Amino acid sequence: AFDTLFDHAPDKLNVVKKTLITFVNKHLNKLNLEVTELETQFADGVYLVLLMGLLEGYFVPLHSFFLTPDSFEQKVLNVSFAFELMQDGGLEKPKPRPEDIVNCDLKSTLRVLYNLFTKYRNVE
Amino acid sequence: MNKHSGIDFKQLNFLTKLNENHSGELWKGRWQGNDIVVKVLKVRDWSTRKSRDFNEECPRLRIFSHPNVLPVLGACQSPPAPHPTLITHWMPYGSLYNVLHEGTNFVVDQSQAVKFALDMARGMAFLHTLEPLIPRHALNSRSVMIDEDMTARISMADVKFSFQSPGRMYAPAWVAPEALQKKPEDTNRRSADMWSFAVLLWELVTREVPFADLSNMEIGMKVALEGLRPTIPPGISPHVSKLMKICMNEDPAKRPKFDMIVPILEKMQDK
Numbered sequence: 573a574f575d576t577l578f579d580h581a582p583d584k585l586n587v588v589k590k591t592l593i594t595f596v597n598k599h600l601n602k603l604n605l606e607v608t609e610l611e612t613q614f615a616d617g618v619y620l621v622l623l624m625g626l627l628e629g630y631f632v633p634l635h636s637f638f639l640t641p642d643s644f645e646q647k648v649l650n651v652s653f654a655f656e657l658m659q660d661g662g663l664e665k666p667k668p669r670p671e672d673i674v675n676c677d678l679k680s681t682l683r684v685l686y687n688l689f690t691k692y693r694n695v696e
Numbered sequence: 697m698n699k700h701s702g703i704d705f706k707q708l709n710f711l712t713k714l715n716e717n718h719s720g721e722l723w724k725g726r727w728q729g730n731d732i733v734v735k736v737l738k739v740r741d742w743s744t745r746k747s748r749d750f751n752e753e754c755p756r757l758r759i760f761s762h763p764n765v766l767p768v769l770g771a772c773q774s775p776p777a778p779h780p781t782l783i784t785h786w787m788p789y790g791s792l793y794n795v796l797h798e799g800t801n802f803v804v805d806q807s808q809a810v811k812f813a814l815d816m817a818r819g820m821a822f823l824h825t826l827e828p829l830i831p832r833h834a835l836n837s838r839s840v841m842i843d844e845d846m847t848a849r850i851s852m853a854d855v856k857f858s859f860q861s862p863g864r865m866y867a868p869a870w871v872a873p874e875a876l877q878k879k880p881e882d883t884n885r886r887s888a889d890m891w892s893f894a895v896l897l898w899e900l901v902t903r904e905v906p907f908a909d910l911s912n913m914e915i916g917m918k919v920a921l922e923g924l925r926p927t928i929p930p931g932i933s934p935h936v937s938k939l940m941k942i943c944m945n946e947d948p949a950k951r952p953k954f955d956m957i958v959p960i961l962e963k964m965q966d967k
């Protein structure tokens with residue numbers, strides 16, 4: 573379904589990417605964080621964790637994840653934890669493996685972000 | 697046989713729903729002649745392990761020995777109950793947060809505020825004499841209840857159980873900076889509670905919600921990493937200013953114990 577928005581409407585795909593860009597900045601700019609590139613800036617799991625707290629109304633204690641991950645393994649653990657926060661919030665288990673996000677798979681990244689956008693687009 | 701059967705869920709009379717949120721549902725009800733509140737907990741991936749843990753953690757909350765501590769009256773084990781459930785007495789004025797910030801009929805005066813502070817300090821001093829809890833306790837104005845005679849009581853039902861996600865913090869404005877950043881086992885948990893009391897003092901002085909203009913994520917990140925602190929209120933007595941500053945010491949080891957500030961607050965009472 574989303575895969576058709578991805579592959580066989582590449583100017584719709586670019587339209588979705590700018591929508592997701594505007595959505596994540598609405599929230600992350602509150603922490604003085606700016607997103608300009610969806611292909612890489614969610615790969616280490618940090619902004620996904622911060623975004624979930626901004627969207628669902630909680631702080632994530634810094635001992636619960638790796639704010640500055642120093643290995644592929646810590647980035648995978650961050651993304652897995654963000655996936656757990658997503659399920660806590662009512663989303664079904666995300667389809668991509670956490671390593672797919674860390675590896676900057678654009679489709680996996682956009683699928684996860686799009687499901688957040690579908691759910692939380694009206695949060696202020 | 698088990699040492700506790702807990703409260704029989706079938707004996708609960710559910711009267712009216714009070715609230716529902718991420719953590720579960722609150723109901724006003726009745727049980728064995730008591731006016732009660734029931735919390736039905738929402739838990740993802742409930743398991744026998746988590747149920748065993750709930751049943752081991754609840755007995756410690758049944759504290760009947762201090763006027764400024766509100767006990768859990770009991771808990772419903774699940775199974776056989778549909779969901780893990782907590783019961784406490786109905787407190788007619790609700791939480792301290794409700795009384796200070798959502799009070800449409802009266803504004804509590806500062807003599808009552810100083811009495812609330814003394815009540816909370818006495819209850820915390822007593823709790824701090826007990827062996828540590830497995831559930832995480834957090835002192836804030838939502839976890840203090842105001843009884844029918846206006847006595848403030850620490851609510852034992854508001855602990856966070858081992859199966860409730862430690863990764864989601866919903867009232868960070870009251871949490872000590874070190875507790876935003878370090879695992880509980882790496883902090884002095886009793887000194888962290890003094891910071892929370894300092895923020896309660898600030899709330900009693902200003903009658904404002906701390907960091908009301910910020911989201912919980914913004915609060916935790918700015919307090920932990922950018923040194924955000926409550927602004928010391930203008931035009932208060934030097935004595936109150938001094939007490940609030942010592943309770944909010946950046947160094948956890950230099951904060952007073954609750955049993956040290958109880959006599960200070962006693963001398964500040966009107967009667």
Ligand SMILES: COc1cc2ncnc(Nc3ccc(F)c(Cl)c3)c2cc1OCCCN1CCOCC1
Pocket residue numbers: 714715722733734735782783784785786787788789790791794798841853854
């Ligand atoms: C007088 O009202 C309450 C008394 C309460 N007395 C004791 N405990 C309460 N809450 C509580 C909190 C956690 C628990 F696990 C349990 Cl068992 C109970 C209480 C919650 C109470 O009210 C909760 C709903 C507060 N409303 C919600 C709607 O907007 C206005 C304030």
Ligand SMILES: COc1cc2ncnc(Nc3ccc(F)c(Cl)c3)c2cc1OCCCN1CCOCC1
Pocket residue numbers: 823824825826827828829833885886
């Ligand atoms: C290191 O000693 C404590 C740590 C604690 N850490 C966290 N919480 C404590 N108590 C506590 C705090 C809040 C509560 F709601 C309840 Cl029920 C109990 C603690 C009580 C503690 O000590 C209680 C006094 C008796 N112990 C016994 C042995 O060594 C230390 C002193």
